[PDB]
Amino acid sequence: MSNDTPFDALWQRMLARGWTPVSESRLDDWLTQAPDGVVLLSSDPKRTPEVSDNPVMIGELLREFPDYTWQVAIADLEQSEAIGDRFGVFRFPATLVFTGGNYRGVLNGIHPWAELINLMRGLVEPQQERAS
Numbered sequence: 637m638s639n640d641t642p643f644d645a646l647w648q649r650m651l652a653r654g655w656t657p658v659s660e661s662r663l664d665d666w667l668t669q670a671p672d673g674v675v676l677l678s679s680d681p682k683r684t685p686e687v688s689d690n691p692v693m694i695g696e697l698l699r700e701f702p703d704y705t706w707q708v709a710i711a712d713l714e715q716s717e718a719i720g721d722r723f724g725v726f727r728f729p730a731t732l733v734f735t736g737g738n739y740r741g742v743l744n745g746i747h748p749w750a751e752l753i754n755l756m757r758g759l760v761e762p763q764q765e766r767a768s
Contacts, residue, residue, distance in 0.1 A: 643678070643713055646688055650676075650710060653695075658709035660718040666709050667734055673707030674698070674733045674743075677716040677725070685747070693749055694731065697756055704735075704760075733759050741768060 637643070651657065658666050658675060666673070681687065698706040711719055716729065725732075731743040733756075741759040745752040758765040 637713065640713075642687075643680075647678070647710065647712075649688065650691065655708045655710045658711050658715070658719075660711075660715050660722065663709070663711070663719050663722075666707065667737060670705075670707040672704040672735045673709060674731050675719075676708070676710045676731050677720055677729050678711065679713065679716050679720075679727060679729045681729070689746055693752060694743075697752060700753075701760065735760075741766070744768065 655676075663675065666675070698704075698708070720727070723732075733740040733743065743752070743755055743759070745755040754765055755767070758767065
């Protein structure tokens with residue numbers, strides 16, 4: 637956006653943690669090339685306690701399933717809007733998880749850890765909890 641610095645820094649922060657950037661036309665590429673993974677569409681925060689909230693718990697969350705190589709793809713600001721448009725999302729920025737070329741769900745959980753696990757649990761293994 638006008639004067640990129642906050643989101644710019646934020647993106648670069650998580651980027652340096654080893655999360656590869658994804659483009660709109662490359663989302664489809666990534667989807668078919670990856671065995672499993674999650675895509676973060678980041679437009680603007682709804683409020684957040686702070687700003688980025690600190691996504692460390694997200695990394696350890698996915699890692700309890702080592703059988704799945706979780707390719708975390710983060711998108712550019714203008715790309716998130718385009719990717720969301722192409723998929724049919726509203727606007728709400730969050731972690732969308734995709735597996736087997738299909739849609740698992742979206743991680744609306746952020747703060748509660750025990751609940752966050754349960755949410756991903758329901759998305760990776762459904763029927764047994766899918767509270768959303």
